[PDB]
Amino acid sequence: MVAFTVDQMRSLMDKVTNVRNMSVIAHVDHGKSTLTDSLVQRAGIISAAKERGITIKSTAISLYSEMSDEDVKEIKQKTDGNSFLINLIDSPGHVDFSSEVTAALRVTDGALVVVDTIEGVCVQTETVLRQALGERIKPVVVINKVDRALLELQVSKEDLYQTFARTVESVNVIVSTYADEVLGDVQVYPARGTVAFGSGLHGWAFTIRQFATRYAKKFGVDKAKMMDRLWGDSFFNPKTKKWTNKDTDAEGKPLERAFNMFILDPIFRLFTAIMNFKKDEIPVLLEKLEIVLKGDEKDLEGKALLKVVMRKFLPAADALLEMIVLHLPSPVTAQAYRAEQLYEGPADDANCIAIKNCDPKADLMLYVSKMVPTSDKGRFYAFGRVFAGTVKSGQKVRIQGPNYVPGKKDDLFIKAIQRVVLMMGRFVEPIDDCPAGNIIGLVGIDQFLLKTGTLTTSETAHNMKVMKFSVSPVVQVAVEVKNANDLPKLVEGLKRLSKSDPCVLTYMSESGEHIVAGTGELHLEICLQDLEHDHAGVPLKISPPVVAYRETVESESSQTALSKSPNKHNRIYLKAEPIDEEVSLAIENGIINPRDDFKARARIMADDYGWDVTDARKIWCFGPDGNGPNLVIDQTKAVQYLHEIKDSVVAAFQWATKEGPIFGEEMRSVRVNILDVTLHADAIHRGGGQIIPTMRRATYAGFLLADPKIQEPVFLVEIQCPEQAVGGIYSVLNKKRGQVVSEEQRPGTPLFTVKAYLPVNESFGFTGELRQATGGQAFPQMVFDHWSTLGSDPLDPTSKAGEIVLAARKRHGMKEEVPGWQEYYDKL
Ligand SMILES: C=C1CO[C@@H]2[C@@H](C)O[C@@H](OC[C@@]34C[C@@H]5[C@H](C)[C@H](Cl)C[C@H]5[C@@]5(C=O)C[C@@H]3C=C(C(C)C)[C@@]45C(=O)O)C[C@@H]12
Numbered sequence: 036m037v038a039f040t041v042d043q044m045r046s047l048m049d050k051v052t053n054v055r056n057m058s059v060i061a062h063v064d065h066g067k068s069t070l071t072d073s074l075v076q077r078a079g080i081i082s083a084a085k086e087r088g089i090t091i092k093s094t095a096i097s098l099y100s101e102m103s104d105e106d107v108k109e110i111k112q113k114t115d116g117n118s119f120l121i122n123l124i125d126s127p128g129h130v131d132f133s134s135e136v137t138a139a140l141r142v143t144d145g146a147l148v149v150v151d152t153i154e155g156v157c158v159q160t161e162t163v164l165r166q167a168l169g170e171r172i173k174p175v176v177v178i179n180k181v182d183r184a185l186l187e188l189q190v191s192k193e194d195l196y197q198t199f200a201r202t203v204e205s206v207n208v209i210v211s212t213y214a215d216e217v218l219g220d221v222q223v224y225p226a227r228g229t230v231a232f233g234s235g236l237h238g239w240a241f242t243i244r245q246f247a248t249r250y251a252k253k254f255g256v257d258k259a260k261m262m263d264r265l266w267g268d269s270f271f272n273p274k275t276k277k278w279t280n281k282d283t284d285a286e287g288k289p290l291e292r293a294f295n296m297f298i299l300d301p302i303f304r305l306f307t308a309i310m311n312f313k314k315d316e317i318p319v320l321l322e323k324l325e326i327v328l329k330g331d332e333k334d335l336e337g338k339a340l341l342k343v344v345m346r347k348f349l350p351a352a353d354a355l356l357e358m359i360v361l362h363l364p365s366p367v368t369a370q371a372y373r374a375e376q377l378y379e380g381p382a383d384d385a386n387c388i389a390i391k392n393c394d395p396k397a398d399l400m401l402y403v404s405k406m407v408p409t410s411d412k413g414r415f416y417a418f419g420r421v422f423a424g425t426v427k428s429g430q431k432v433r434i435q436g437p438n439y440v441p442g443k444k445d446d447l448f449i450k451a452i453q454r455v456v457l458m459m460g461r462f463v464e465p466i467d468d469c470p471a472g473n474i475i476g477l478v479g480i481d482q483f484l485l486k487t488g489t490l491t492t493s494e495t496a497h498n499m500k501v502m503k504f505s506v507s508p509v510v511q512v513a514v515e516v517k518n519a520n521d522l523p524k525l526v527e528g529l530k531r532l533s534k535s536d537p538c539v540l541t542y543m544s545e546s547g548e549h550i551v552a553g554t555g556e557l558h559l560e561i562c563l564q565d566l567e568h569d570h571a572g573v574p575l576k577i578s579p580p581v582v583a584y585r586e587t588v589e590s591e592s593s594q595t596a597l598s599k600s601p602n603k604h605n606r607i608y609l610k611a612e613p614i615d616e617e618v619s620l621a622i623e624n625g626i627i628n629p630r631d632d633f634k635a636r637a638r639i640m641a642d643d644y645g646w647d648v649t650d651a652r653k654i655w656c657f658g659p660d661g662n663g664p665n666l667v668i669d670q671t672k673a674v675q676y677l678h679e680i681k682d683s684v685v686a687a688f689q690w691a692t693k694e695g696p697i698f699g700e701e702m703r704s705v706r707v708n709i710l711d712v713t714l715h716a717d718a719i720h721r722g723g724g725q726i727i728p729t730m731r732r733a734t735y736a737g738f739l740l741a742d743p744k745i746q747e748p749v750f751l752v753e754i755q756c757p758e759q760a761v762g763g764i765y766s767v768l769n770k771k772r773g774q775v776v777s778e779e780q781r782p783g784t785p786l787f788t789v790k791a792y793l794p795v796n797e798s799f800g801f802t803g804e805l806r807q808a809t810g811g812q813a814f815p816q817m818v819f820d821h822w823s824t825l826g827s828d829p830l831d832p833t834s835k836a837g838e839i840v841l842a843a844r845k846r847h848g849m850k851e852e853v854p855g856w857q858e859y860y861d862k863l
């Protein structure tokens with residue numbers, strides 16, 4: 036549109052009182068693009084001077100505009116000259132709530148909210164506006180698609196007005212409701228020229244002020260008052276030739292409002308005449324309004340003409356530009372009431388002040404809004420705003436991350452800025468510097484600032500409103516080699532991955548699978564990628580990690596269990612019953628140890644865990660692995676060669692409990708009581724290969740008679756997030772048998788710390804699903820917490836648990852049926 040040299044741009048960048056950092060806030064289909072596009076063609080700036088080339092993803096655009104000596108006097112705000120530099124920063128239309136959006140606005144001071152003439156203000160509209168308000172962004176309105184109502188609906192004039200009327204009122208509800216008391220009445224007033232009406236597709240729009248001036252010069256009145264009248268309850272009676280503050284002429288008759296008589300009328304008459312082909316009235320009407328056509332335009336018809344005559348009548352572009360310049364704040368103005376909020380430090384601090392003043396001579400205070408993709412071979416550029424001091428190419432800056440703390444040296448990076456550039460839509464342009472108050476990009480920060488961050492030149496500097504990260508590994512899957520022979524390389528490469536990525540984690544699952552875990556899904560992504568193509572460079576099959584379970588019993592076996600050796604000579608009679616959870620834990624945590632003296636040990640189980648004191652000294656072993664939470668207590672009476680079979684009964688128990696009868700999982704909280712034992716006179720028939728199997732079977736039998744169940748692992752998740760999104764937590768948690776434990780708020784500033792239990796086998800995907808429910812606001816952090824017995828029957832293929840088992844057996848190539856106890860029991 037207009038081309039400027041790089042110097043010209045720096046000159047404009049010097050008068051920051053004539054700059055406007057804004058964006059366009061709008062609903063999903065309200066003309067946000069046809070409208071900004073309209074502006075761009077009118078005022079868009081372009082690079083002056085104009086296999087190999089460079090490009091960046093559009094993130095901002097620059098518009099230039101000159102005003103009239105008079106229009107610059109209505110600017111109730113420190114100005115400097117007839118010129119202006121508008122910054123049209125792009126914002127995410129459809130992206131989740133608070134992350135992509137919040138960050139973008141933060142570098143804007145004003146907004147241009149687009150509302151629809153028919154649908155009025157919808158949810159999203161009200162949502163982003165509330166968002167913008169939160170950061171104290173002043174709103175200015177534009178009701179769009181006024182053409183739909185004029186054609187399709189055929190609406191009246193007072194009908195339409197009333198619409199505009201409402202739409203304005205709702206917006207003013209949201210305004211007052213979320214506006215900082217200290218900022219004053221930011222409510223939009225059509226009569227004050229802060230609300231524009233028009234059609235972005237047709238190309239026309241208008242503010243009341245534009246009409247209040249048209250009529251102001253001709254008939255000789257000051258517009259101050261002509262504006263107040265041209266909207267609301269002010270009527271002008273042709274007859275009385277005077278105005279009134281009541282909608283009824285003395286005689287009791289209804290009059291026509293000004294807005295309708297002086298604004299809408301002219302318009303309506305033009306539609307109706309050109310849209311009905313009244314080739315005789317068009318000429319006289321156009322003449323009357325002072326709309327001159329040129330050349331072949333004189334012979335247009337219908338829609339073709341409505342657009343020409345309408346765009347000449349009220350160029351959408353000038354209405355928008357008006358409001359922008361005359362009502363939206365400049366940095367100098369906004370950075371004064373927006374300084375505290377954007378600074379996380381002392382509101383009296385040296386820097387926090389250089390923001391308010393928007394002083395380019397203070398200590399650098401540049402905020403990075405986001406990292407933008409570019410054709411420069413995988414390099415990203417930093418897009419942000421210079422809030423204080425000034426940036427320079429090759430400058431030495433202190434890059435502070437989201438965790439950085441003034442004292443502590445974490446997230447801090449004392450590197451230098453390669454180049455400072457202009458982000459002109461899809462193109463960039465190098466410059467020498469950029470003072471406080473502007474929008475610029477930075478090349479060479481890539482690797483030190485992932486996303487949001489603050490750049491400073493002061494060592495006693497604080498960070499600007501920062502965004503929190505997820506830094507614990509949580510996203511994990513099971514990695515395995517496709518050709519068994521590559522195993523050595525998979526292993527080889529897992530130590531390679533770890534040695535390079537300090538934010539990755541690798542380990543062996545209880546169920547023997549190698550495991551890769553990472554920060555986010557994107558992180559795991561890059562990780563598994565490199566692993567298979569460089570670290571290990573071997574084909575791998577990635578999958579959800581297999582969960583381990585615990586086979587346990589619910590009560591004392593309904594009946595005694597019997598089992599005879601394959602000698603038909605020796606028999607064993609036992610029963611199984613549950614061990615208490617507080618106890619099982621004690622065994623697990625080593626408070627009750629099989630290696631500790633019977634002295635200390637006997638004491639603890641009697642004097643601290645209710646165990647009958649005699650019991651303590653008749654346990655033969657804990658298991659599996661000699662020290663697990665399962666006991667074999669000897670309750671026999673007159674077995675001659677008892678002490679003779681002990682060593683065997685033990686090795687049998689250490690086997691049974693390592694791989695239970697349900698599906699081979701480890702048993703937990705299982706206490707086996709041997710009620711009696713009968714042996715053969717000779718030791719030649721009570722050997723190992725005779726007793727071991729007897730006990731193995733015997734135990735299984737008692738076990739299944741004891742109302743079997745299974746225990747599932749359970750995580751203990753911790754979450755941090757803003758008060759509003761604490762809803763998503765409970766939202767998703769419910770869809771996964773979750774359970775909120777505690778909800779504590781960190782004193783100081785909003786950020787809740789939700790804590791809950793999460794069934795390990797309901798956690799695949801959780802991290803992602805969380806991002807959604809909270810629009811990228813919360814970040815999880817898991818850890819194993821405990822075992823929990825499932826209520827359902829493990830031998831009923833259809834029950835919850837029973838499905839868990841079933842699939843398991845199929846995965847192992849075992850029978851789908853779980854051999855009931857009868858299979859192990861040997862009746863007398
Ligand atoms: C989310 C994270 C981040 O890093 C942590 C790592 C260190 O520990 C992880 O905790 C991993 C656990 C730890 C416990 C206990 C050892 C008892 Cl025996 C039962 C096991 C589990 C088995 O079902 C239950 C948990 C989820 C698993 C696999 C599905 C991978 C487990 C495993 O096999 O290691 C949680 C991870």
Ligand SMILES: Nc1nc2c(ncn2[C@@H]2O[C@H](COP(=O)(O)OP(=O)(O)O)[C@@H](O)[C@H]2O)c(=O)[nH]1
Nearest residue numbers: 063064065066067068069179180182234235236
């Ligand atoms: N009649 C009419 N259609 C419009 C107007 N503004 C936008 N549209 C149409 O609405 C649709 C969506 O508009 P667009 O600007 O892409 O919406 P966005 O999603 O807000 O960017 C398109 O088909 C446009 O042609 C307008 O003022 N009048």
